[PDB]
């Protein structure tokens, strides 16, 4: 068949790359994942992920992992609040919808996927820096580690990938929004008023161009994110200096309730990130020297504010893995072309929705109401 006596290199062990590896490996394909992280115990900073019926859940179902996801995920409702702490809307999880998109911790999702792979599928401390096409095989160059070869390379190393040029000359762009994220440990003790306002639900609030998103129970930690249009002055806050970030945020949140200000004051450290997009437009390069493609945020990074992100990437893994293993294609290149053509349609729809949603939500008069 297409991959008999051939091997596949996946670049990046995020949720998308590890899913791609499981879907190929369960079909008897020789596949390795190269992951820059030093070891499997690396904590992944970030909020939870939720898998959707028909995309992320379909990939887990094909892998035999859907029940494992359900068992480690948490169905969560959503509260909409104003800047004064008034709950404007409470949507609790109804038992009939409890399988719709339960929330999973990113380390828990990585553990499910790693435990599903054969020993030594993931090669840790392997930061890909360059590719070179040979006669039949790619040579992979890693930072300060020996080279490897593969018949097929799948780029899955996230939105800021610098190994995309064999596929496309498209560049990542800033969208003009900015995100500050943090975790609070023991939130029932350290931000009790804000914790009680969430009342076991996710919470969202918007006032004068500032958005706040919180999850009060990411494996017992509260995760929150504040998003706004990137200030022109920054076209001036040191994210290593918590006192500088606190000062900036308390000026921005000056007319919000003290339950929100308490969140800012008690946070031990903050992470800042400009919103970026890897825009799908014109098709990627045709006639590449050897078989290569991209999946996940490497293919279609987009703003996350409407819940686009990992589900598009898991759909990529499901489509590409099916094309490589279903025996219908005459070549790996044709299997790749078919996946890319499909991904350009659902990916452009997702990016269009994400970008329109970002425009609407950052108008200075928006409220989730
Ligand atoms: C603030 C915020 C909030 C959200 C989200 C993003 C952001 C920024 N997302 C998006 C979601 O997190 C995203 O789509 C997925 O993490 C993409 O998974 P990937 O595996 O493609 O990349 P991901 O970035 O997760 O993984 C890439 C992997 O490759 C590795 N790597 C990088 N460079 C490498 C190199 N050169 N060599 C080897 N390995 C390398 C990295 O270490 C990492 O393990 C989201 N999505 C969603 O569905 N729901 C949500 O609620 C949110 N929320």
Numbering used by the authors: 12 to 246, 250 to 383
Manuscript text:
Recently, several plasmid-encoded variants of the tetracycline-degrading enzyme Tet(X), such as Tet(X4) which confers high-level tigecycline resistance, were found to be produced by MDR bacteria isolated from animals and humans. These novel enzymes degrade tetracyclines more effectively than Tet(X). In this study, we characterized the mechanism underlying the degradation of tigecycline by Tet(X4), resolved the crystal structure of the Tet(X4) and tigecycline-Tet(X4) complex, and revealed the substrate basis of Tet(X4)-mediated catalysis.
